[PDB]
Every structure is written in C-alpha cells, then in structure tokens.
Design a binder for this molecule. Structure first.
Ligand SMILES: O=C(O)[C@H]1O[C@@H](O[C@H]2[C@H](O)[C@H](O)[C@H](O)O[C@@H]2C(=O)O)[C@@H](O)[C@@H](O)[C@@H]1O
Length: 311
C-alpha cells in the first residue's frame, strides 16, 4: 500500500468555459485546471482502484489500503478549508466530486475498517456533506447537474453511517432532479448547453441513477418516484448517442461527436431496471465503464453489487 499523498484543506481550481452557456472550452485554462486539481483526481482514482481490487475477492489488503488513504485525508481535514472562486466555482465542484469518490470508496470497503478509522472517516464525510450542502443555500447557484452530483457523496455518506437525516437530505436532491424532468424528457438547464446538451443529459442522469441504486441498500425504491420520468430522460440519452437529431433541434446546436464513457456507466445499473432495456444495448457495448467519482468500475458493480460481500 503506497503512501497516501498530502490531503490539503484548501482547493484552488480553475474554470475553463468562456461562453454564457458554458459550452466553449478554453484549452489553456483546461490544461491548467488539470494541474491544479491533479491531487484530488489522483486520490479519487487510487481509492476507487483499491475498492475495485478488493471487490474481486482474495484481496483484503486492497480494501485496507483504501481505508488507509481515506483515514489520512480525514485526519488532515482534506478539502474542509478554503474554496477559491476564480473564473467560476470549479473548486466547489471539485469538493463535491471528490467527496463522492471518497464516500463511495468508504461505503464499498468499510467492512474492513478499524474502530478509529470509522470515527475519523465518518466524521470527515459528514462534515464534507454539510459543507457541500451549504454551498447550495445560495439560490444564485443554479441547481443543474452539479446539484444532483452533490447528492452522490451525501447519499454514500448516509448509507455508510446509517444516518437517516442525511439519507432524507440525499432523497430531496434525487427528487429535485426527477421533478425537473419535463414531460418530453428534457432537462432545460442541461438542454441550454448547446453542442454539449446530450453530454449533460447523460451527465445529469448518472448521479440520479447511482443514488437510486444506493437507496435500495436502505430498503427504499426511489425508482418508483414519479415513475416514468427517469425512463423518459434515460431513453433520450440512449437515443441521442444513436442519433443526435432530437438534441440538435432541441438545443439549437449540432451535438459534439462523443461516445459514451466514464459516468455514462450508469447504464450498467439502469438497463437492469428499465421497462425497455434493449434501448441501452449500444451504450452498454461501448463499455466497460469506470468512474472513480461513482465508486470505480460500474460495469462490475452493476453485476456484483455496489458493496462486496464481506469475507
Ligand atoms: O471537469 C470535469 O471533470 C467534469 O466537468 C463536468 O462539467 C462541469 C464543468 O467542469 C464546469 O464546471 C461547468 O461549469 O459545469 C459542468 C457541469 O454542468 O457540471 C462534466 O462535463 C464532466 O463530464 C467532466 O468530467
């Protein structure tokens, strides 16, 4: 188990969108944001890799390594300090995404935690939850897909610590996303993203599906909430990768040519749930899907279960 890197209290990230619709990328800004957020993304990638390795079985050491990394960042109060707002709110988004990855890793490996690791890690995860939730008390922050993504870390924290009030907090975020889906399946704030409209409908679906899967671990069936709406949005995403003409006319821009990847792996879970699974065949075939911000290997988790059976 390699030594965990420093886990700084602060985050000073860099926005890289230049147009009001946030669909035009500034490459120098993006390359430079990649350097600023490197330790956060490397921490997320490593813990998810350890949790994946633990989930294969016969590799308890990998699970304990993830817990060693999570404890080190809990003990240094990683990401609980100052968030710089320069160009936009990329720092707050990094705290959200990285909290989710850390919380999913803990949820997947916590069966191996010592008592001290549980105290440290769970306290750190609940303070991250509170800080990420408080960011959205400002109504000037539009609750697009970044709000839904904030639910990931809150939800995984709630399940891992059996924290029912935090569970209900995540439920309100999931229900807000479902309630924003229009009868034709549009999410207006994602459809405002021009050539990235399809990309961001995909991106909005991913944390909603992952939260719904996690709710099953607490005996709740969030898929029935306004049953119909999630399927309508997910089917539009699948249709869009097959042929983008609906997103072209709805967004007013020819969609970027991108294939499904990373967080598109929500389809691995959702195809086992949909009233029309075959629509997701091409999306499935573009896998396997890995996203550290979603707990790691989504292809394997959809078939194994998010949490490995304890040894
Ligand atoms: O940068 C990433 O790692 C992810 O960015 C996501 O889009 C963000 C984007 O970074 C900006 O913060 C912009 O203001 O808002 C986007 C959002 O709506 O969340 C995704 O594009 C994701 O695919 C990237 O991996």
């Amino acid at each position: 188990c390699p030594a965990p890197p420093p886990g700084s209290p602060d985050i000073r990230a860099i926005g890289y969108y230049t147009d009001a619709a946030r669909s035009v990328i500034d490459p120098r800004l993006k390359t430079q944001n990649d350097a600023a957020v490197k330790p956060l993304n490397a921490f997320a990638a490593h813990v998810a890799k350890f949790a994946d390795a633990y989930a294969k079985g016969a590799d308890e050491a990998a699970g304990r390594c993830a817990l060693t990394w999570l404890d080190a960042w809990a003990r240094s109060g990683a990401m609980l300090g100052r968030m710089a707002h320069v160009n936009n709110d990329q720092s707050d988004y990094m705290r959200q995404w990285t909290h989710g990855a850390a919380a999913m890793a803990y949820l997947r490996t916590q069966a191996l935690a010592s008592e001290q690791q549980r105290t440290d890690i769970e306290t750190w995860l609940k303070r991250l939850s509170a800080a990420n939730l408080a960011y959205w008390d400002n109504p000037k922050h539009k609750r697009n897909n970044a709000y839904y993504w904030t639910g990931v870390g809150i939800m995984a924290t709630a399940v891992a610590t059996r924290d029912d009030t935090l569970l209900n907090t995540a439920q309100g975020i999931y229900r807000a996303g479902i309630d924003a889906i229009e009868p034709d399946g549009r999410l207006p704030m994602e459809m405002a993203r021009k050539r990235l409209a399809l990309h961001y409908h995909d991106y909005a679906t991913a944390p909603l599906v992952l939260m719904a899967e996690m709710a099953r671990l607490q005996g709740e069936d969030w898929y029935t909430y306004r049953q119909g709406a999630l399927e309508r949005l997910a089917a539009r995403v699948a249709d869009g990768y097959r042929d983008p003409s609906w997103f072209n006319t709805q967004s007013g821009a020819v969609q970027e040519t991108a294939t499904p990847k990373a967080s598109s792996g929500w389809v691995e879970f959702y195809r086992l749930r949909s009233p029309d699974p075959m629509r997701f065949d091409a999306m499935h075939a573009a896998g396997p899907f890995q996203d550290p911000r979603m707990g790691g290997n989504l292809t394997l988790m959809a078939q194994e279960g998010i949490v490995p059976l304890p040894q």
